Amino acid sequence: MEDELYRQSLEIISRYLREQATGAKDTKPMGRSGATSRKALETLRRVGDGVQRNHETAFQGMLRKLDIKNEDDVKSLSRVMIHVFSDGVTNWGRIVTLISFGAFVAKHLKTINQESSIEPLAESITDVLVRTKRDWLVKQRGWDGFVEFFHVEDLEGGHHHHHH
């Protein structure tokens, strides 16, 4: 029921959530795009951790009244995930914030034994991503554009904001 682009992104996000949940690094290969998914994953984990550090005090504020006890709560998280992009602006950092918050909830899920909820949660992250940022993903090469924007394997700058 997915797209090729959906499966690749789903795999990347799925791994990061499982790694954060298990408190360790995973062993699986990267989905579809060997290099793109690799560079995307390592960038996601390094910057996502930082986002969690500064945002943790904020996320816990909602997480306490959320507490996912079944997939239906994840379906509710989807509504929040949509609002995470409702800023109107671009900011690839929000893409990171989406996946980072997903991992932040995922680690809580494994803590409460709800690991089965983590995977459909990762699908929810990818679902909203592909639902609203579909065109941006392919047009700006999403993951390839993500790594240059945050300047990991980049040597130019990535930043080139133009409004019209």
Swiss-Prot record:
Q: What induces it?
A: Expression increases early during phorbol ester-induced differentiation along the monocyte/macrophage pathway in myeloid leukemia cell line ML-1. Rapidly up-regulated by CSF2 in ML-1 cells. Up-regulated by heat shock-induced differentiation. Expression increases early during retinoic acid-induced differentiation.
Which function does this protein serve? Involved in the regulation of apoptosis versus cell survival, and in the maintenance of viability but not of proliferation. Mediates its effects by interactions with a number of other regulators of apoptosis. Isoform 1 inhibits apoptosis. Isoform 2 promotes apoptosis.
Position of motif BH2?
A: 135-150
PTM comment text: Cleaved by CASP3 during apoptosis. Treatment with taxol or okadaic acid induces phosphorylation on additional sites.
Q: Can you name this protein?
A: Induced myeloid leukemia cell differentiation protein Mcl-1
UniProt GO MF annotations? BH3 domain binding; channel activity; protein heterodimerization activity; protein transmembrane transporter activity
What do we know about how this protein assembles, alone or with others?
Interacts with HIF3A (via C-terminus domain). Interacts with BAD, BOK, BIK and BMF. Interacts with PMAIP1. Interacts with BBC3. Isoform 1 interacts with BAX, BAK1 and TPT1. Heterodimer of isoform 1 and isoform 2. Homodimers of isoform 1 or isoform 2 are not detected. Isoform 2 does not interact with pro-apoptotic BCL2-related proteins. Interacts with RTL10/BOP. Interacts with BCL2L11; may sequester BCL2L11 to prevent its pro-apoptotic activity. Interacts with GIMAP5 and HSPA8/HSC70; the interaction between HSPA8 and MCL1 is impaired in the absence of GIMAP5.
Q: Which UniProt keywords apply?
A: Apoptosis, Cytoplasm, Developmental protein, Differentiation, Isopeptide bond, Membrane, Mitochondrion, Nucleus, Phosphoprotein, Transmembrane, Transmembrane helix, Ubl conjugation
Stretches of the chain forming a coiled coil according to its record:
none
Q: Which family does it belong to?
A: Belongs to the Bcl-2 family.
Q: Where is this motif: BH1?
A: 83-103
Top-rank lineage group of the source organism: Eukaryota
According to its UniProt entry, the protein's GO biological process terms are: cell fate determination; cellular homeostasis; DNA damage response; extrinsic apoptotic signaling pathway in absence of ligand; intrinsic apoptotic signaling pathway in response to DNA damage; mitochondrial fusion; negative regulation of anoikis; negative regulation of apoptotic process
Taking the first listed entry, what is the main subcellular location of this protein, grouped into a coarse class? membrane
Which species is the source of this protein?
A: Homo sapiens
Gene of this entry:
MCL1
Q: Does the keyword Transmembrane apply?
A: yes
Q: Where in the cell is it found?
A: Membrane; Cytoplasm; Mitochondrion; Nucleus, Nucleoplasm
Q: Which part of the chain holds the cross-link Glycyl lysine isopeptide (Lys-Gly) (interchain with G-Cter in ubiquitin)?
A: K25, K28
Q: Where is this motif: BH3?
A: 40-54
- One cellular component term from this protein's GO annotations in UniProt: nucleoplasm
